[PDB]
């Protein structure tokens, strides 16, 4: 039995990347609610099978099955959306983007899914101080590079939104304020120094933070960052706050998030395992909309875990729910 807990998931052939992600998504009740609304035949197998699994993985009352078979979802993926081989290891983050995009594609075939946010992208030429049109880009996750004394999530966020200077950037303005040269006459296209900066625009109800543990060495080889990145149960994003997705559009603690799951990669740059720390399903009569109890889940194996253990882990994907506005 799994009395105070949740079902595990069969590993269907190196599919820890799917099981860990499912356990994480199951701890995001807003995403589940969205999918429920959404799911209310091959073309919709992905969303239906995902819905069935998340529902079975988010039930306060224990279900009939200790371990679930995610075969309908894997099948829908491999056959219809993401043509991966049967026994190859994959990146849970890459699966995450496959799912959000596939679900949005089922949708446009209506509110956006709750992981969806927007970044603001500002840039200006240092030579003429002309500001470029603002880009408002969708995001489904924030992929943070880890800076190089311990590293904190806040330092990663800060690095993400910090301004930078970029050289040899085309500026049409400075190109036209340029005198031509008598050679015929040639007008050299002016490339200048720009300041650029990303800021958090619209914040999602469900937040997926992706810590980039896989990078590239100076010697030209992949390397995995193993070091702890210090993160907290509660994350305030107030600090980190036209063209939209490429299309010209129109434009005319408050942001407090509570951690609900931590997906962890165990292994090196080439392979390994994924496990998930997650909250227990919400109870009907809790004093909070969330359970204070945590679980550790490795495919079929489920156990209780302490928040200490959670916070001390090597986070790869972090999942949060936005807490109701003040």
């Amino acid at each position: 039995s799994h009395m105070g807990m949740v079902p595990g998931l069969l590993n269907l052939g190196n599919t820890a990347f799917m099981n860990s992600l499912l356990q994480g998504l199951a701890a995001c009740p807003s995403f589940i609610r969205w999918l429920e609304d959404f799911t209310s035949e091959r073309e919709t197998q992905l969303s239906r099978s995902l819905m069935q699994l998340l529902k079975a993985l988010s039930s306060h009352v224990p279900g009939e099955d200790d371990v679930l078979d995610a075969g309908g979802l894997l099948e829908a993926l491999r056959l219809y959306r993401w043509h991966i081989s049967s026994f190859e290891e994959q990146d849970a983050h890459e699966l995450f983007h496959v799912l959000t995009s596939s679900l949005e594609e089922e949708q446009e075939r209506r509110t956006r899914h709750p992981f969806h946010g927007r970044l603001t992208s500002y840039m200006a030429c240092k030579r003429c101080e002309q500001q470029s049109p603002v880009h408002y880009d969708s995001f489904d996750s924030l992929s943070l590079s880890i800076p190089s004394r311990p590293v904190t999530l806040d330092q990663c966020l800060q690095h993400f939104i910090s301004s930078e200077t970029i050289k040899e950037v085309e500026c049409e303005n400075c190109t036209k304020q340029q005198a031509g040269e008598l050679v015929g006459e040639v007008l050299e296209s002016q490339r200048t120094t720009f300041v650029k900066q990303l800021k958090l625009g619209k914040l999602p109800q469900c937040l997926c933070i992706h810590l980039q543990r896989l990078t590239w060495s100076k010697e030209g080889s992949p390397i995995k960052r193993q070091e702890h990145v210090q993160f907290t149960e509660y994350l305030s994003l107030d600090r980190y706050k036209a063209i939209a997705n490429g299309v010209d559009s129109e434009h005319c603690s408050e942001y407090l998030f509570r951690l609900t799951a931590v997906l962890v990669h165990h292994g090196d740059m080439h392979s390994g395992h994924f496990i998930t720390y997650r909250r227990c399903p919400a109870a009907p009569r809790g004093t909070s909309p969330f359970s204070s109890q945590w679980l550790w889940v490795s495919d079929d194996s489920v156990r209780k875990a302490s928040l200490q253990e959670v916070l001390s882990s090597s986070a790869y994907l972090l999942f949060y729910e936005r807490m109701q506005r003040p």
């Binding site: 290891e89 994959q90 983007h97 959000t100 950037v169 896989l214 590239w216 995995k224 490429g246």
Partner: protein
């Protein structure tokens, strides 16, 4: 036309492209600047991961668009 790629250190580089360029082409240009083999690159634009065989034009990727470069960390 010029677009931006946010690299693995969070530093943003420029790329010189055509709307007709394929994602494979773009990945080749990124390899030219960063030394990362195209088959190890994942490119994301406006939260969508770009796929080989499509063009920038297919994705409405315009001048000064920002692509995000991430690698693929496997676990099974």
């Amino acid at each position: 036309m010029q677009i931006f790629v946010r690299t693995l250190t969070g530093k943003t580089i420029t790329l010189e492209v055509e709307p007709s360029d394929t994602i494979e082409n773009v990945k080749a240009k990124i390899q030219d600047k960063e030394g990362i083999p195209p088959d190890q690159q994942r490119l994301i634009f406006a939260g969508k991961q770009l796929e080989d065989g499509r063009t920038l034009s297919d994705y409405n990727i315009q001048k000064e668009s920002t692509l995000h470069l991430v690698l693929r960390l496997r676990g099974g």
